[PDB]
Amino acid sequence: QEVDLTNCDREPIHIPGAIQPHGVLLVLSEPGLVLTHASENAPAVLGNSAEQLLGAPLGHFIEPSVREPLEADLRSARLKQLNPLKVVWRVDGVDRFFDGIAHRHQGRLILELEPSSHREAVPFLSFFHAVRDGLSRLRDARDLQELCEAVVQEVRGLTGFDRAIIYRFDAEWNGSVIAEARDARADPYLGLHFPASDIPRQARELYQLNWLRIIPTIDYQPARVRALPGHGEPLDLSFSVLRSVSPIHLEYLHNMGVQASMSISLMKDGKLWGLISCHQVSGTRYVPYEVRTACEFLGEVMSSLLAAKEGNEDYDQRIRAKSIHAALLERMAREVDFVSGLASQESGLLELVHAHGAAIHFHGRTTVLGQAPSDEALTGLIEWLGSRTGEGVFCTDRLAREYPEAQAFQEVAAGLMAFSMSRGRNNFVLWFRPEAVQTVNWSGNPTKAVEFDQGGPRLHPRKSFELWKETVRGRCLPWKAYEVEAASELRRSIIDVALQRSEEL
Amino acid sequence: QEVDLTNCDREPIHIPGAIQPHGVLLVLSEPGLVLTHASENAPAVLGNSAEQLLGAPLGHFIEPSVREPLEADLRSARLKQLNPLKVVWRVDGVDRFFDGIAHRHQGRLILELEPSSHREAVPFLSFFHAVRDGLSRLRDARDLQELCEAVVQEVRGLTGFDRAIIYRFDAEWNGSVIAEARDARADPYLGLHFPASDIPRQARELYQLNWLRIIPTIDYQPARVRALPGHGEPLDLSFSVLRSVSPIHLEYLHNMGVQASMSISLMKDGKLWGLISCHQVSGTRYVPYEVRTACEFLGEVMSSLLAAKEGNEDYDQRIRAKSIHAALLERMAREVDFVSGLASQESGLLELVHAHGAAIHFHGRTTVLGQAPSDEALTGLIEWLGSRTGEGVFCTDRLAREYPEAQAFQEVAAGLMAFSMSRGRNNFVLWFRPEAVQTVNWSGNPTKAVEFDQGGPRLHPRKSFELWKETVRGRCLPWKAYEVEAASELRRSIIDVALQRSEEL
């Protein structure tokens, strides 16, 4: 299987067929630039019913002097750079001014107008210091905490959001507010863990594609998108600025007491690393696209810089383990029975991967070594490995997640790292580890992270986001990066001296 | 001792006591205030002569509303996130505006003032957009050829230089132009190679620490950094931006017919990996600090991607290899004599590293697969001890370097990929490659450059930079690092079946 979706992961956030009403979404034909769809809030904002617009060339509605550069651009395929377009819409004799945001996706050409007349507006002065200084600050960050610390201060500053945090995912996609800047109005979340389920899978993948979103108000009545016939196929809105969002997330922000929000994907290695996340606790926030893409730009600068600073590292040990490996290989090098010459090095063996126990099943015939008793349970643990995969270095910090019968044992208070000495898969090498107790602070009860309706099958978000002390058990400490290099390394040398043994008949 | 300094690794280019004069170098006491050094070209740039300037405190000549934030700024511990400084100079009744570039080095505070051109909204918005878009273009580079191409186009875009190239060092600290964007009317340096003696060691070392230098004109007059008595210790000007470059280099640049110069260090692994080099072939090039460090920032991001994008090189042959190797992994199952399992798909085994000969020496008996040396291949097969495998893959394109008897057969094997199968080192796979004649475009006879004055004991650069072919004998076509990879992978996979086979009989 492997994944293994829950109820939340089954929603299609991408094709709601409705948008946020504060500005208009059109799709143009190519090469006609003819309005094929138009969202029904068109009069409200533009001056025309959808009726009037469906099936006209676009140049009909544009003030004749700015017709040329706009067409010339829309037809460019260098588009995402050209944004934001200047659009002037002329009803009767009156001119309205919008920012055009255009993109092509799944064969359509979408254009979204946001009013740039009646504005929030950002004094260029501090727009200038944010992207000019901001860049310099980030680049001068000494460690991972200073980078985070700078990016939330700069973004907040440029946007005047009440709260703006850094949320960092973990290996199961649980969250964690590892940096924060705010105005004493908002309750500090620095520290709180959130469940994986707050940002479900169909979201998280969308967000790896579209690195920026903004909800200026949770209170709107979505605008349906009209078409003219032939195109009742639900239009794909993955890259719409104005796409309407899942209403249980509107309800979630409502249970969180935030009135507008905005976030930005952080990427390390083209998988979602974290989020910059911004809340207005009270009052809508209509942030102009320029200031959006300025903030978006500052996440891309952090993203492109995480690998440097989060490489504050630990390259020692690594040199230590590289030197424990040198000794062990030497022992086996020299006994004619290396299994018995490996476990004769209980220290170097235990200390290669930082384990508190270890085991060697070889031609029979278990020999245990450190502090991990099992024995009558170790037999279950072994043959369990041989069955369906366990090749190469298995590795888990919660052996009840895979082998649910380890909860019965010491648990990952004997945590596993293992592999087979050969491909025939009959001789293994194990590794066990104590428990990491660790009381963890949640935002609300995790186990009631989803509440249900009447009477109804319908999912609502939780109500309390108050702190909630959980003590997590089975999980041990993580198997760090190098610790799993030195397993395959030791695997590769167990194979060499074994190969040289038999070459010696 | 490693390096090994010819005649140029002496001249202390870091204490010339003179500056490129288009700006003013200052040295301020601390706590704040009061100047002890002043470049003599003070009055050209700034009104006042360096004798009115010497001894007085800075804020005396600064417009008053500007004077507190500035001395609050020149104290801050970390001024690198501050540059450029808003310095407003009030000579007579007029204000003149300068970029201030601040830095502390060897207990001394330096302030160099370039002239500033006042930042306006519309042109900044385009500058921001271009750093923002050139940045993603680096991120999205598939391979190193792409990553480089991006860099020089973007740097050029932002700067208006005639040429930007990417200059890569080899093992001897020689050079080669490996990517190039340029206005076409100026001569094309792509492909060229330059002797290790245009950038002597103390210059490479200096650029290892300071990553950006700009010579906006090569014909200029070095304003001397004058001072106050008691403060005559030579001025450590390494982290200066005005620091007058060493004179022989300026002859290098006139003689190269280049009028303005800019360069940026790239780092891979803390060693100096290459540069991004920039040239104005007719005209000057004064590039404001902001635009300047925004290219250095692209230089950081470039270096931080060297290793990833390069591993993705040949991302079509890698597939092939993976596929041929898949093929050999299994034809070594149908036959219990896995050796002939390789020798059947010898058309394979040879295309796996694009070798035209091979040799398998297994249990004392050897078999030969392509054009190979005489059956006294018992040569290299015995020849090795230090390096030699140990394990794993050994690899050359000058076998008659390490193992001189190969001069005999260097027309059927002047290169050699070989590894040893067992820790015993009785078993080897060997791959051969013939001598390839190979022609190497230098930039005018590289045996020169090491040139003297009259000859008086002064140093002088070359004179003709014209395409000087070298013809490199005794070598084979270089081994692609994905070929060594394929050979490494193959070796470990032969070991797994040499184990599995013996173990199970």
Ligand SMILES: */C=C/C1=C(C)C(=O)N/C1=C\c1[nH]c(Cc2[nH]c(/C=C3\NC(=O)C(C=C)=C3C)c(C)c2CCC(=O)O)c(CCC(=O)O)c1C
């Ligand atoms: C059954 C599913 C859901 C439950 C239960 C729930 O509580 N939310 C569910 C679905 C859901 N969430 C989102 C989008 C989303 N979620 C978050 C979560 C957080 N915001 C924060 O500030 C913090 C902690 C500091 C967390 C953990 C965010 C940021 C987002 C992005 C939207 C935004 O920034 O406003 C979706 C997708 C909505 C969409 O249309 O894209 C869904 C279905």
Ligand SMILES: */C=C/C1=C(C)C(=O)N/C1=C\c1[nH]c(Cc2[nH]c(/C=C3\NC(=O)C(C=C)=C3C)c(C)c2CCC(=O)O)c(CCC(=O)O)c1C
């Ligand atoms: C006797 C020593 C020298 C000889 C001979 C010579 O030719 N130069 C010598 C000394 C020297 N050079 C530099 C600075 C420098 N040199 C280069 C070389 C190149 N620029 C190019 O475009 C290419 C190829 C196309 C080459 C090979 C560079 C790039 C630099 C860096 C400065 C810059 O780019 O403008 C120094 C140090 C000068 C200083 O004062 O900082 C010295 C001592």
